Design an enzyme around this catalytic site. Structure first.
Site, PDB file in Angstrom:
ATOM      1  N   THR A 239       0.823  -1.211   0.000  1.00 44.80           N
ATOM      2  CA  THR A 239       0.000   0.000   0.000  1.00 44.80           C
ATOM      3  C   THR A 239       0.861   1.268   0.000  1.00 44.80           C
ATOM      4  O   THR A 239       0.583   2.195  -0.751  1.00 44.80           O
ATOM      5  CB  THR A 239      -0.977   0.041   1.215  1.00 44.80           C
ATOM      6  OG1 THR A 239      -1.669  -1.209   1.323  1.00 44.80           O
ATOM      7  CG2 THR A 239      -2.003   1.150   1.038  1.00 44.80           C
ATOM      8  N   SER A 282      -6.422   1.300   0.017  1.00 42.64           N
ATOM      9  CA  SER A 282      -6.832   0.117   0.764  1.00 42.64           C
ATOM     10  C   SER A 282      -8.333   0.289   0.945  1.00 42.64           C
ATOM     11  O   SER A 282      -8.784   0.846   1.944  1.00 42.64           O
ATOM     12  CB  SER A 282      -6.139   0.061   2.123  1.00 42.64           C
ATOM     13  OG  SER A 282      -6.498  -1.128   2.804  1.00 42.64           O
ATOM     14  N   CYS A 348      -5.895   1.896  11.326  1.00 42.78           N
ATOM     15  CA  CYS A 348      -4.497   1.573  11.066  1.00 42.78           C
ATOM     16  C   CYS A 348      -3.502   1.924  12.166  1.00 42.78           C
ATOM     17  O   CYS A 348      -3.343   3.086  12.543  1.00 42.78           O
ATOM     18  CB  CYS A 348      -4.054   2.208   9.757  1.00 42.78           C
ATOM     19  SG  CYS A 348      -2.376   1.792   9.306  1.00 42.78           S
ATOM     20  N   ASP A 389      -7.298  -3.047  -5.900  1.00 41.32           N
ATOM     21  CA  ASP A 389      -7.174  -1.732  -5.276  1.00 41.32           C
ATOM     22  C   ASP A 389      -6.346  -0.831  -6.184  1.00 41.32           C
ATOM     23  O   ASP A 389      -5.532  -1.309  -6.984  1.00 41.32           O
ATOM     24  CB  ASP A 389      -6.503  -1.820  -3.902  1.00 41.32           C
ATOM     25  CG  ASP A 389      -7.490  -2.098  -2.777  1.00 41.32           C
ATOM     26  OD1 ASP A 389      -8.533  -1.416  -2.689  1.00 41.32           O
ATOM     27  OD2 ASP A 389      -7.203  -2.993  -1.958  1.00 41.32           O
TER      28      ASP A 389
HETATM   29  C1  HEM Z   1      -0.491   4.528   3.401  1.00 40.88           C
HETATM   30  C2  HEM Z   1      -0.538   3.175   3.721  1.00 40.88           C
HETATM   31  C3  HEM Z   1      -1.540   2.562   4.465  1.00 40.88           C
HETATM   32  C4  HEM Z   1      -2.891   2.624   4.309  1.00 40.88           C
HETATM   33  C5  HEM Z   1      -3.737   3.568   3.434  1.00 40.88           C
HETATM   34  C6  HEM Z   1      -3.402   1.703   5.294  1.00 40.88           C
HETATM   35  C7  HEM Z   1      -4.739   1.446   5.447  1.00 40.88           C
HETATM   36  C8  HEM Z   1      -5.283   0.670   6.450  1.00 40.88           C
HETATM   37  C9  HEM Z   1      -6.723   0.411   6.568  1.00 40.88           C
HETATM   38  C10 HEM Z   1      -7.903   0.863   5.694  1.00 40.88           C
HETATM   39  C11 HEM Z   1      -6.816  -0.429   7.622  1.00 40.88           C
HETATM   40  C12 HEM Z   1      -8.121  -1.024   8.013  1.00 40.88           C
HETATM   41  C13 HEM Z   1      -8.400  -0.533   9.396  1.00 40.88           C
HETATM   42  C14 HEM Z   1      -9.820  -0.789   9.810  1.00 40.88           C
HETATM   43  O1  HEM Z   1     -10.214  -1.975   9.906  1.00 40.88           O
HETATM   44  O2  HEM Z   1     -10.540   0.211  10.023  1.00 40.88           O
HETATM   45  C15 HEM Z   1      -5.489  -0.692   8.191  1.00 40.88           C
HETATM   46  C16 HEM Z   1      -5.193  -1.602   9.223  1.00 40.88           C
HETATM   47  C17 HEM Z   1      -3.923  -2.019   9.624  1.00 40.88           C
HETATM   48  N1  HEM Z   1      -2.756  -1.515   9.085  1.00 40.88           N
HETATM   49 FE1  HEM Z   1      -2.558  -0.089   7.696  1.00 40.88          FE
HETATM   50  N2  HEM Z   1      -2.396   1.147   6.099  1.00 40.88           N
HETATM   51  C18 HEM Z   1      -1.251   1.657   5.568  1.00 40.88           C
HETATM   52  C19 HEM Z   1       0.031   1.313   6.018  1.00 40.88           C
HETATM   53  C20 HEM Z   1       0.338   0.427   7.048  1.00 40.88           C
HETATM   54  C21 HEM Z   1       1.688   0.073   7.419  1.00 40.88           C
HETATM   55  C22 HEM Z   1       2.950   0.735   6.879  1.00 40.88           C
HETATM   56  C23 HEM Z   1       1.557  -0.919   8.343  1.00 40.88           C
HETATM   57  C24 HEM Z   1       2.570  -1.606   8.992  1.00 40.88           C
HETATM   58  C25 HEM Z   1       3.501  -0.992   9.817  1.00 40.88           C
HETATM   59  C26 HEM Z   1       0.124  -1.127   8.561  1.00 40.88           C
HETATM   60  C27 HEM Z   1      -0.432  -2.028   9.466  1.00 40.88           C
HETATM   61  C28 HEM Z   1      -1.770  -2.224   9.707  1.00 40.88           C
HETATM   62  C29 HEM Z   1      -2.312  -3.212  10.633  1.00 40.88           C
HETATM   63  C30 HEM Z   1      -1.475  -4.174  11.471  1.00 40.88           C
HETATM   64  C31 HEM Z   1      -3.656  -3.079  10.600  1.00 40.88           C
HETATM   65  C32 HEM Z   1      -4.705  -3.753  11.485  1.00 40.88           C
HETATM   66  C33 HEM Z   1      -4.932  -2.947  12.768  1.00 40.88           C
HETATM   67  C34 HEM Z   1      -6.018  -3.518  13.643  1.00 40.88           C
HETATM   68  O3  HEM Z   1      -6.854  -4.284  13.135  1.00 40.88           O
HETATM   69  O4  HEM Z   1      -6.054  -3.187  14.841  1.00 40.88           O
HETATM   70  N3  HEM Z   1      -0.612  -0.288   7.771  1.00 40.88           N
HETATM   71  N4  HEM Z   1      -4.529  -0.017   7.448  1.00 40.88           N
END
Ligand code: HEM
Length: 399
Positions: A239, A282, A348, A389
């Site tokens: 992403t 995403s 996130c 996506d």
């Molecule tokens: C610009 C990049 C990114 C976008 C747009 C993005 C987007 C998202 C979105 C839409 C969710 C769904 C959250 C929900 O259920 O409401 C999410 C969850 C998550 N993201 Fe990202 N993310 C990004 C980058 C990252 C990065 C760099 C990591 C890792 C370090 C990461 C780790 C996670 C994890 C582990 C979850 C699950 C959190 C939970 O369920 O408590 N994301 N992200």
């Protein structure tokens, strides 16, 4: 019921369906690949509701969870990490790794993030464009977020290059099911040996923290430390890569926006905020199953029925963002926040880290390469396939 996921109207555009549904049928049913019927919510209002409701579940084992592909159905059988958990197990596991991602922890990481970006730009400058533009994705967009996350996890510097290519292979379009699987176990195997080292000789990184604070005291098993670490690597890397490339293409598409950024790199945060709103890279992560009957708008979702909340649609909601289909880094933001990173408890974990990396990239890129430009006609940009996506596969540039 129309089949979902919908196809993007075009390369950089979201599905044409959202706008019409938002206006004529905000909460409706769509059909998934296996014949299942799931509810699709399109209004910002309803997406926030779906993302915070206690009557909804994120557990993938529950019958009715909206799996979008066969492969996704098979991936649901593995032991869950906090991403697929409901309270109170969710926060219990999430809080173990959350400290490195808090706003202040990320503020302390700025000097590092900046140097990583500066080093990668310089490497790209040390190969010029001798009758040959460089692919911004392979030379920069990919390395930036990969080296950072790998380094935070604990991977030594000399291994970054090889491990970066392996992770890329998992999500690469031209990758066989065999090579993608081999890459997965390659990464998992490496993470396992790393957890063993950090148990003996811990250091300053996410894995050592897990080993010292959760593994040793018997809070979690070693395999769990491997799982969470693997989750942190794969969850948002692909992403970030796309968001970086998408940001460059967008600036190419609106020269007026680029001019303002070049003239004032201080505009980077505003550019990033609009980018994460406009390009919801995403869009298929907010899915739930109703634990009990719940009323959303005028519909009534019954117990055990699946729901998909489109944050991409919510981010183009005319009711919230005036002139939503216009990219404007100077836009006046409403009190309601954009949903590019989700909402609620599952929002996130790396949102602040993601924004810091993007802001660092976009406040430095054009100061280093003032004359940076996409080498191919905008209409020829190689976007990800329309049913996936939004993203960009490769991006030829000259500077
Ligand atoms: C610009 C990049 C990114 C976008 C747009 C993005 C987007 C998202 C979105 C839409 C969710 C769904 C959250 C929900 O259920 O409401 C999410 C969850 C998550 N993201 Fe990202 N993310 C990004 C980058 C990252 C990065 C760099 C990591 C890792 C370090 C990461 C780790 C996670 C994890 C582990 C979850 C699950 C959190 C939970 O369920 O408590 N994301 N992200």
């Amino acid at each position: 019921a129309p089949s979902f996921p919908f196809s993007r109207a075009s390369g950089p555009e979201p599905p044409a369906e959202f706008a019409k549904l938002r206006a004529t049928n905000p909460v409706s049913q769509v059909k998934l690949f296996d014949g299942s019927l799931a509810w699709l919510v399109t209004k910002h209002k309803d997406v926030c509701f779906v993302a915070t409701s206690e009557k909804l579940s994120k557990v993938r084992t529950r019958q009715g969870f909206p799996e979008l592909s066969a492969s996704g159905k098979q991936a649901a059988k593995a032991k869950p990490t906090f991403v697929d958990m409901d309270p109170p197990e969710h926060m219990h596991q999430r809080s173990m790794v959350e400290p490195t991602f808090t706003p202040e922890a990320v503020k302390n990481l700025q000097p590092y993030i900046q140097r990583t970006v500066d080093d990668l730009l310089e490497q790209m400058k040390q190969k010029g464009c001798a009758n040959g533009p460089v692919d911004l994705v392979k030379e920069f967009a990919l390395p930036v977020p990969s080296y950072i996350i790998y380094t935070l996890l604990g991977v030594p510097f000399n291994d970054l290059e090889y491990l970066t290519q392996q992770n890329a292979i998992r999500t690469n379009g031209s990758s066989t099911a065999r090579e993608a699987s081999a890459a997965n176990q390659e990464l998992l195997d490496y993470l396992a040996i790393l957890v063993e080292q950090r148990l003996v000789e811990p250091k300053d990184d996410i894995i050592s923290k897990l080993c010292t604070e959760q593994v040793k005291p018997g809070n979690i098993d070693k395999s769990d430390a491997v799982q969470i670490a693997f989750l942190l690597l794969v969850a948002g890397n692909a992403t970030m890569v796309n968001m970086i490339a998408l940001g460059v293409a967008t600036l190419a598409q609106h020269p007026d926006q680029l001019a303002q950024l070049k003239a004032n790199p201080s505009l980077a945060p505003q550019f990033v905020e609009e980018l994460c709103r406009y390009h919801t890279a995403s869009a298929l992560a907010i899915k739930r199953t109703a634990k009990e009957d719940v009323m959303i708008g005028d519909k009534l979702v019954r117990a055990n029925e699946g729901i998909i909340a489109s944050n991409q649609s919510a981010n183009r909601d005319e009711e919230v963002f005036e002139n939503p289909d216009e990219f404007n880094m100077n836009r006046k933001w409403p009190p309601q926040d954009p949903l590019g990173f989700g909402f609620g408890d599952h929002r996130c974990i790396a949102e602040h880290l993601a924004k810091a990396e993007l802001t660092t990239v976009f406040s430095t890129l054009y100061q280093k390469f003032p004359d940076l430009k996409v080498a191919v006609p905008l209409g020829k940009i190689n976007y990800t396939p329309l049913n996936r996506d939004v993203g960009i596969v490769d991006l030829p540039v000259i500077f």
